[PDB]
Design a binder for this molecule. Structure first.
Ligand code: A1JA0
Lengths: 182, 182
């Protein structure tokens, strides 16, 4: 029930507003003289969606192969008393064994971090057994809403991963893999 | 259950981050030469929380006595892949019968607009009977979390109103009333 809400409020309150735009984000950045012909930024927002853990804020400390590159242009909007709502995203370079596969506008779905916090907040009453179905149904609902919303289904790709045990998991390869897919 | 999540994710994902700061927002704006001694902006974020209707985006069209004044300084942060998350708020002037009672940093709680949208989204399965308990428990949970979070309890005031029938309701007086309260 909780994850359901957050997925709807993430789409309606954020994606539903910035997915129809943001094409010029990677248009101006890739054609900037200080990076002209140095990787063309991809046409979509790659959302990192962990499934077992709380979302980290810094990508460098999470995966060494992940490296902060730069920040793309900012935006504006009339949002609940904010006639100029600034939207900003940060570009990252996927460096797999020194070899940089590429760079794209990247960010984690923030509502996923909030539904993890809820489990260690005894007032919210969210339990760790439900947690699994929560983070999962947040990605599921975000995939399901993106299906019924074709104007949002494109312009964004979802990167979900489950790494509970050790299998040299790398959240950096998942991205490079998803970019080459289509 | 849904409203519960949104209130937690609004605090943890937005208020819990910008309430400890934002004091300098009204400090620099009130002392700007183009407004020096023309109303000192209040020290808190006044959140508009309707209880029966969907939040409007524009305040002018909602209440004539409400009038857009200006926008305050912007902010930055390390948020899920965004090393510079821009936070921006807009100041409004409460004009009651020509007489401007004052001006303060104002905005509607955006998660309230999303929980209304959910009622007319048959996929989300949210019903209009629950809607009442939803919008209500979103404000209730936001008041309850602000009680257990003293570092956030201050620096913000909640303005909840229920106007289903006609009683010349004015969402402009509610604000001026709340500012003089303390
Ligand atoms: C209304 O519902 C949401 C709006 C946004 S906007 C947003 C970002 O831009 C990503 C930056 C970040 O989150 O770090 C994420 C969400 C997620 C939700 S789901 C409800 S819980 C919540 C509410 C809230 C309000 C925020 C505002 O800045 C106010 C303006 C607005 O919402 O349009 S951020 C935010 C984050 C939330 O949970 C993650």
């Amino acid at each position: 029930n909780v994850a359901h809400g957050l997925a709807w409020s993430y789409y309606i309150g954020y994606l539903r507003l910035i997915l129809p735009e943001l094409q010029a984000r990677i248009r101006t950045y890739n054609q900037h003289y200080n990076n002209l012909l140095r990787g063309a930024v991809s046409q979509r927002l790659y959302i990192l969606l962990p499934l077992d853990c709380g979302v980290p804020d810094n990508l460098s400390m999470a995966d060494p192969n992940i490296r902060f590159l730069d920040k793309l242009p900012q935006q504006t909007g009339d949002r609940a008393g904010i006639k100029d709502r600034v939207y900003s995203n940060s570009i990252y370079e996927l460096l797999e064994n020194g070899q940089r596969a590429g760079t794209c506008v990247l960010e984690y779905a923030t509502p996923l971090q909030t539904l993890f916090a809820m489990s260690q907040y005894s007032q919210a009453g969210f339990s760790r057994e439900d947690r699994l179905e929560q983070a999962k149904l947040f990605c599921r609902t975000l995939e399901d809403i993106l299906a019924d919303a074709p104007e949002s289904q494109n312009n964004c790709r979802l990167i979900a991963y489950q790494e509970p045990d050790d299998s040299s998991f790398s959240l950096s390869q998942e991205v490079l893999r998803h970019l080459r897919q289509e």
